[PDB]
Amino acid sequence: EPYKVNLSQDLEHQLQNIIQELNLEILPPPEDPSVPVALNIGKPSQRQNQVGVVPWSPPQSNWNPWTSSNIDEGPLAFATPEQISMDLKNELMYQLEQDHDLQAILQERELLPVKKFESEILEAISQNSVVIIRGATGCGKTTQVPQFILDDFIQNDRAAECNIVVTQPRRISAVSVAERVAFERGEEPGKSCGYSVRFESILPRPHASIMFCTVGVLLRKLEAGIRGISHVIVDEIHERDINTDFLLVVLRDVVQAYPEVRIVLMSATIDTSMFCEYFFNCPIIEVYGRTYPVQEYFLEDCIQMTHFVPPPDANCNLICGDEYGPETRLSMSQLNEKETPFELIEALLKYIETLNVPGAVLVFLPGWNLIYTMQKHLEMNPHFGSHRYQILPLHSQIPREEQRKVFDPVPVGVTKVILSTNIAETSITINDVVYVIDSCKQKVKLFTANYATVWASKTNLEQRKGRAGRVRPGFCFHLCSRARFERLETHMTPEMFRTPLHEIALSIKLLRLGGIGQFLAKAIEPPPLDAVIEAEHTLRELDALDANDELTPLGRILAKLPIEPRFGKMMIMGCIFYVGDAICTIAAATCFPEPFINEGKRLGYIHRNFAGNRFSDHVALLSVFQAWDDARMGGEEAEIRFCEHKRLNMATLRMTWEAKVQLKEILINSGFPEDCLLTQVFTNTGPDNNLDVVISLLAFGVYPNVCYHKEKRKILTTEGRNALIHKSSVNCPFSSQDMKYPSPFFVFGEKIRTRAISAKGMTLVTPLQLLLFASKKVQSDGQIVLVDDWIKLQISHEAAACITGLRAAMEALVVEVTKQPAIISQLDPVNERMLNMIRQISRPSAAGINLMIDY
Ligand SMILES: Nc1ncnc2c1ncn2[C@@H]1O[C@H](COP(=O)(O)OP(=O)(O)O)[C@@H](O)[C@H]1O
Ligand SMILES: [Mg+2]
C-alpha cells in the first residue's frame, strides 16, 4: 500500500513557482489513470577518437620520474650521469663493507631460490623487450628481481640510467614490499625504494630507484606518458587483476612503438602461454627451489581423523564415499556448505599437535568477518591462550605493524596460527609453514545492478596446498567435500569477465587510446559485450560521456578522481552546494573500513550517540570526524585517548582524513574555489540545512541502494526482495525492536550477501529526497506515484512533477559548472533559487518530519 506524503501548501506553491521560473512545465495528469505518465525527463558534439599509444622515454639525469618534474634547486641539480653513477656506487660499496648487519641480510638474500637464476634473468631482460619470469610462490621474484636489475646498473656504472616501476594488484602489497626491499638494502622507504598507492606515498630518490605502486596510480599518471622509466615490472599477473589485464593492453602497444623499454611480467606456476603469445612469444625464465610433498585432505577426512560431530549446485555434503565410516558420513551431512565449520578447525588444530612435528598452521578464510569470528572462537578457550598458541590475523585492513608479526619467529613450544585471506596464496610467503587449513572459498565482488562468498578454483586449492611444502613434508586440510571438489571450476574467471568497466572506460578516454569497445577488444581476454554496453550506458547517464562516447569536462574530472565516478559527481554537487568538505569526507570514507571498534557485533552505547537523531550511519561517521578533529588539537596523546576511549580505530581516521585532503586537492586544481570546500561545523540533533543537503547528495551518490522498512530488522530492496538491517547499523534495534522511524525510506552503502542479505551504512531519507535524487523512473496516475516500479507514494502529481523537474535542472547546472567550475561563486539568481528550493526540499520539515522531539 502507498505511503502518504504531507506537503504544506506553501511548499506546494514554491515548487510550482520555481519550475515556472526555470521555464519548465508540469506534465498534466493522465486522462485515463490506467495509462500513467513519466514525470522523469531527459536533458553535445566534439571530435572522434582513433587509436593512440602512450608515449615512452628512458631515464634522464635532470628528471624526477616519481614527481614528474625537473631538478633545478637540488644538490644533484646540474650533475652529470657519471658523477651520479659513481657516487651511488661508492655509497653502496662503502655501506656493504662496513654494515655487518646488512652483510648478514645480504647473505640471507643470496640463499633464496631465485638467486641461482640471477645471470639468466638479467641477460634475458637485457636482450628482449618483454620477459616473463615464472616460478613458485616463495622463490623471491618480487623482492629480488627489481634489486638484481638495479644493482646490475649500479655495479656496471650505469646507475643513472635505471628507474624501475613495479606494479602490484593490492595496496598492502606495494607498501609491504617497498618496506621489505628497503630493509634488504639497509634503508628506509624513500631512498632507493618507494611506494605510491591511492592517498599515500613515500617517493624514492630521483635516480637509480624502484617505485612499487598499484596499477590505478600508474594508470592515472599515464596521461603525461611513461616518462624517465627503463623498466616496467608487472607483478603477480596470474591473479588476473582487471587493472593489470588492462595495463597489459597499454604496455603491448608501448613495446611495439618503443622497443627500448623493458617490460618484465612476473608470474606464479601457471600456464603463461596466454601472456607469452600476447607479447610476441617472449622468453620465459623458469625459477624453482626445493619442494616437499603435501598430503591433502577434504571435509570427509577432517571428520574421520578428529572424530568430529557438529552441533544440532546441489549440496555436496550428502555425497560421501563408501570407504568412509557411517558417523563420518552422517556428521558431514549435518554441516551446511555455505558456512565454514569453525568447530572443525579447532579440532584440526588439536589433531595437528598430536602429530608432534613443530610448525605454523596457515588458515585460509574469506574476509575479515570470518577471521575475527575464528579468532574469538579460539581465544575464548584456555587451550589457545598465549602459552601454547600465537594466533595472528592477516588481511589488507590491519596495522602494518601486525602484518610483520606473521613473519616473526615464536617462543619454542608455541604453534603459530595465521588466519589469512588469499593474500597468503601467491602474494606473500610466511615462514615455517607445515600445515594449511583451507576453507576453499573466495570473497569476490559480483555486482549486477556487493560482496559474496563463493567457491575457489582447483588452481586456488592447488596453490594453497603448496604453501605447506617449503620447509618439510606438509599437510593441507580442505574444508570442502570430495563431491564439491569435482564440481569446482578449474580456474577462477578473470575479473575482466565479471567486473564493471566504468573506471577503465574513463581511463581509456582520458588517455586518448580510442573507442572503449575497440580498445577492450584487444585485451588478452576481452570482457563480455554487455559489460561494455553497461559501462558506456552508465557514463552517458552521468554526462561523463556525450552521445558520441566522447569525454566531457565532467567526465574528465571524474577520471582524475580516484573514486567511483558516481561519488565523483556527488562531490561536484557538494561543491556547488558549498558542502564540499562533508561530501569529500563521505567519499573518502568509502575506501576504508568502519572507524568503529565493534567488539560485540551489536552496536555500542557510545557509537549510537554519534548518530544523533538523523538515523544515519553516514551522519555518525561525519560526527566522529568532527570530534576526532577537535580532539586532535591537543596533540598525539589526546588523539590516542579520544580514540580508545570512544572505541575508534585511529589509523582509519587518519587514512580517511588524508584521502579527503587529496580529493579536495584534485577539486581545487580542477577550478573549484576554496570557499566551497572549507570544513563546516554542524549538529546531529538540531536543525542544520547543510547536513540536510549532505543527506540529499548522499542519496544521489549511493543510488540505486534504496530500501523500505517493514518492522524489526526486515526491509525491502529495489526489486521487491527482502533483506535485513546489518547489526553494525545505528538504525539496527536491540533484541527489543522498538525503533519507530519517522520515515521508512533509507539509502545504504553496501549489500552484504552472507547466508541472508544485509544492508550496511543506512541513512534515513524523506519521500522528497527519494523523488529528487534516489530514483530514476517516476510514474503518476494523478493520485499515486510509482517510483522505480516498486515504491508507491500517495503524493500530489504537481509536486512530484516539480521535484523531478528540479533533479533535471540540477543535472543541467552540473554540466554548466563543469565547463568553468569557478562560476559557483557567481551563479545567476534563478539557479540560486533552484539550489535554495533543493535546500528546502532536503529539510525533514518539508515532508512534515520532526527529529528534535522523540517522535
Ligand atoms: N616482510 C617480510 N618479512 C619476512 N620475510 C619476508 C618478507 N617479505 C618477503 N619475505 C621472504 O622472502 C621470500 C619470498 O620473497 P618474495 O619476493 O615475496 O617471493 P615471490 O617470488 O613469491 O614473489 C620468502 O622466504 C619470504 O618469507
Ligand atoms: Mg611476488
Author numbering: 272 to 314, 320 to 588, 605 to 741, 747 to 1152
What does the paper say about this structure?
DHX9 [DExH-box helicase 9, also known as RNA helicase A (RHA) or nuclear DNA helicase II (NDH II); EC 3.6.4.13] is a DExH-box RNA helicase which exhibits unwinding activity for both DNA and RNA substrates. DHX9 is a large, multidomain protein whose RecA domains (RecA1 and RecA2), which are required for helicase activity, are bounded by multiple auxiliary domains; these include two RNA-binding domains (dsRBD1 and dsRBD2) and a minimal transactivation domain (MTAD) N-terminal to the helicase core, and a helicase-associated domain (HA2), an oligonucleotide/oligosaccharide-binding fold (OB) and an RGG box C-terminal to the RecA domains. DHX9 has been implicated in several biological processes, including regulation of transcription, translation, replication, RNA splicing and processing, and DNA repair. All structures were solved in the presence of the nucleotide reaction product ADP.
Broad crystallization screening with human DHX9 alone and in the presence of nucleotide analogues (ADP, ATPγS and ADP–AlF4) using multiple commercially available crystallization screens did not produce protein crystals that could be optimized. As the structure of human DHX9 was of the greatest interest, seeds prepared from crystals of the species ortho­logues were utilized for crystallization efforts with the human protein. Using streak-seeding techniques, diffraction-quality crystals of human DHX9 were identified in the presence of ADP and Mg2+ in similar precipitant conditions as dog DHX9 and a 2.62 Å resolution structure of human DHX9 was determined. Despite similarities in precipitant and the use of either dog or cat DHX9 crystals to promote crystal growth, human DHX9 crystallized in space group C2221 with two molecules in the asymmetric unit. The second molecule in the human structure superimposes with a symmetry mate of cat DHX9 and similar packing interactions between human and cat DHX9 crystals were also observed in the extended space. Hence, DHX9 represents an inactive state of the enzyme. The inactive conformation of DHX9 lacks an open, continuous channel through which RNA could bind.
